[PDB]
Design a protein around this ligand. Structure first.
Ligand code: HEM
Length: 364
């Protein structure tokens, strides 16, 4: 909540206030009312899989499972996980390849410069989500217009979509939830709408911010760019390392104590806010001796997608988009470079998810 804990003056450093708090320990009391800040890798994994911590902000919209606990969460989670099938994953991977290639085709057709956010980083994830939800070609413009806005207009869209899927089932996930998931009870229109919007909202800004902040960082770290571009077989490690290092979720992952409890030696009253700082945890020097950006590091676990029963439902889609997107940009925009000085690129401090507002780039 205090801005000291939110603001990141630069993608390369942990916010000084956080560094300060983490010196008092990996689960540390701070003041909002005391809340606790988790900055240790092993302790963050503990809290995120400890059942004494809730995702319900208040207890201590139907189908909005991100703020539910088991067993209500489990119902929805099982249904969505059920519908992330190998067929769906395979078809979405191909669609993602086509999406990223189309946006790069458009950028090359248009000139030798572009704002990467406008032309690539927002379009790619919104189109991905179109394909996931079953939005028809002729409705993407409208979906993109709305998506920018940032219910009830958007809520009206998903209602229409839902009604269309009940009448006319396709292979999308909303169709799957209606017709194929053996749901019982059957999902209401309201639940389907909130699920659809949850997927949009969880996957849009996050994926966009990884795509733009990642290119921003690589543009400033020529040895790292050259590694991604020149060794395409290590795209999977590169993406893990970008996920860990950029830590776009900000100011972190929130939980709320269900009851008075003791954790890592702290005495936390029921209701208290506990926040896992993704960027601090992902640079825990007790776990990564050298936590600097290194795209040659073999893949190991991080917290960028969280952990436990709520860990990112979309993480495989997100990975496929980042793997396909970063590789497509670096392969196809020759000598890609910033078109302004790096210090002039505006970062998103005054918003939740960290990233960039705009990213002017050029190529030959
Ligand atoms: C780089 C991109 C992304 C990042 C960093 C990200 C990160 C996260 C994190 C940290 C959580 C856990 C929140 C918590 O524990 O409270 C989360 C949950 C979630 N993510 Fe993502 N995510 C991304 C992309 C996506 C995509 C593309 C979708 C599309 C389906 C998506 C859907 C979700 C949903 C539905 C949840 C809630 C899961 C539940 O509560 O069971 N995410 N994500």
């Amino acid at each position: 909540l205090p801005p000291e804990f939110v603001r990141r003056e630069d993608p390369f450093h942990v916010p000084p206030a956080l560094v300060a708090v983490s010196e008092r320990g990996p689960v540390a009391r701070a003041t909002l009312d005391p809340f606790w800040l988790v900055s240790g890798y092993e302790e963050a994994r503990a809290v995120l899989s400890d059942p004494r911590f809730s995702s319900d902000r208040f207890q201590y919209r139907a189908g909005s499972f991100i703020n539910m606990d088991p067993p209500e969460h489990t119902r929805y989670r099982k249904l969505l996980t059920g519908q992330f099938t190998v067929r769906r994953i395979r078809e979405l991977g191909a669609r993602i390849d086509e999406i990223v290639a189309g946006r790069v085709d458009a950028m090359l057709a248009g000139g030798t410069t572009a704002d990467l956010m406008t032309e690539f980083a927002f379009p790619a994830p919104s189109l991905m989500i179109c394909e996931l939800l079953g939005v028809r070609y002729e409705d993407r413009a409208e979906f993109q217009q709305r998506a920018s806005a940032l219910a009830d207009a958007l809520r009206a869209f998903m209602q229409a979509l839902v009604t269309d899927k009940r009448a006319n089932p396709a292979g999308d996930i909303i169709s799957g939830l209606i017709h194929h998931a053996g749901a019982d009870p059957a999902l209401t229109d309201d639940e389907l709408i909130n699920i659809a919007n949850l997927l949009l909202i969880a996957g849009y800004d996050t994926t966009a911010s990884m795509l733009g902040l990642g290119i921003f960082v690589l543009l400033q770290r020529p040895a790292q760019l050259a590694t991604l571009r020149d060794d395409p077989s290590r795209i999977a490690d590169a993406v893990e390392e970008l996920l860990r290092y950029l830590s776009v979720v900000n100011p972190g992952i929130f939980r709320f104590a269900k009851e008075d409890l003791e954790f890592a030696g702290e005495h936390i009253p029921a209701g208290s806010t506990v926040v896992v700082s993704v960027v601090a945890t992902n640079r825990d020097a007790r776990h990564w001796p050298d936590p600097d950006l290194d795209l040659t590091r073999p893949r190991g676990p991080h917290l960028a997608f969280g952990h436990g029963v709520h860990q990112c439902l979309g993480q495989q889609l997100a990975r496929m988009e980042m793997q396909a997107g970063y590789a497509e940009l670096l392969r196809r925009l020759p000598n890609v470079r910033l078109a302004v000085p790096p210090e002039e690129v505006p970062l998103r401090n005054d918003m939740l998810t960290y990233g960039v507002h705009s990213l002017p780039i050029a190529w030959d």
